[PDB]
């Protein structure tokens with residue numbers, strides 16, 4: 155029922171969202187591959203299966219300086235998206251500087267890092 | 280704003296969803312001569328009978344638990360519970376009837392508009408930014424190993440060890456008395472708990488440390504008592520938490536936490552074991568001992584195939600990991616429809632919790 159869940163994995167391709175203050179916000183398609191190191195992202199790769207179905211790989215990417223609420227949310231969103239896709243996604247934790255070969259493979263001009271990002275959603279006690 | 284309450288055997292951790300920490304942390308104790316809760320119950324213990332409504336992570340006294348919850352809402356958080364969706368936590372393998380009871384009380388006694396119950400160990404894994412791993416959760420009353428894959432615990436592989444903080448406090452009391460001091464009374468128990476939390480650590484190699492302790496004074500520490508007297512603690516510093524690895528120290532035939540962790544992993548599907556070894560997450564107050572992570576890394580390495588990638592994760596905030604995971608979960612835009620509502624409870628009754636809350 156979340157707008158972005160409805161849009162997730164409808165066709166082959168790559169979808170990227172950024173965790174922004176406890177919400178999943180779509181990343182502009184022109185900005186794909188440029189990751190803020192202070193933020194966390196959810197990445198869904200959808201592949202056409204010969205069987206007509208779609209193959210799903212969910213990757214949650216964690217920037218070196220992302221806050222606990224962002225890394226926590228990215229993980230939970232991953233579980234929820236996977237559940238939404240009837241459990242059929244394979245889940246991958248991707249840490250800045252240690253990303254898997256297949257994840258790095260998604261970005262044809264190579265992925266790049268940039269310092270900064272959106273502020274934490276947490277209220278400080 | 281939603282509320283998050285994490286009820287343990289020894290401590291209640293409560294607060295507001297979206298906060299980075301619980302605003303209320305207090306002893307899970309109810310005293311009766313018409314009732315006192317927490318710290319105020321402890322200070323007046325000479326004139327009342329104290330009871331712990333939660334034993335080994337499981338609620339066993341529902342009358343007293345209601346008082347804990349009432350005190351949490353009104354005295355600690357100062358909220359009208361009827362205004363706030365409330366997330367509660369539960370132990371691994373919490374009986375079905377207990378889950379239903381929890382639900383019944385929240386809607387029927389406190390009249391919350393919405394509620395949810397989550398497994399404590401799963402919330403801690405989420406707090407570490409993980410969907411797959413094995414949690415070692417050790418508090419005041421109980422220790423669990425909980426393997427989790429793609430967001431969900433594997434019930435068949437969960438291990439329970441009835442040895443935690445309380446036993447370690449009592450043991451440190453015994454070995455300090457054996458050293459030459461006398462820690463025996465309920466007031467002396469509270470002092471020893473502070474020594475435990477301040478001076479104890481886990482030795483990387485226990486026998487080597489026992490040799491260093493007997494030949495030198497380099498491992499000795501001084502502690503000032505409330506009366507002003509200064510005492511010296513030696514090998515007791517590391518002998519106390521060694522009990523976690525060698526439960527025979529208190530006359531228990533159970534395997535140590537390193538062996539239960541291995542055993543838990545080995546009960547899981549062979550295809551996920553690598554992910555488990557690489558994601559050992561520690562949570563709870565009893566995992567706070569300096570050196571515990573380094574020792575677990577060493578012990579699991581000795582148990583596993585030599586080529587296995589092993590990683591122990593011990594966040595500084597792991598006393599409150601369960602609570603923080605709950606705070607994050609309840610704050611998510613996607614969590615809004617996941618709550619059990621008052622309407623849904625009225626339609627379906629308490630059994631709704633088994634369908635809405637894994």
Ligand SMILES: Nc1ncnc2c1ncn2[C@@H]1O[C@H](COP(=O)(O)OP(=O)(O)OP(=O)(O)O)[C@@H](O)[C@H]1O
Pocket residue numbers: 286287288289290291335336417418419420421422443444445472475476477562563564565566567568598
């Ligand atoms: N720095 C520390 N070092 C060692 N032990 C600690 C430290 N801080 C707290 N503890 C111990 O941790 C215990 C409380 O932790 P926690 O709140 O996780 O338990 P709980 O949730 O009440 O109990 P359980 O999870 O067993 O039901 C107490 O026994 C306390 O003495």
Ligand SMILES: [Ca+2]
Pocket residue numbers: 192193194219220221224270271272273274
């Ligand atoms: Ca950020």
Ligand SMILES: [Ca+2]
Pocket residue numbers: 236241242243244245429
């Ligand atoms: Ca899946």
Ligand SMILES: [Ca+2]
Pocket residue numbers: 286287288399418563601
């Ligand atoms: Ca606990």
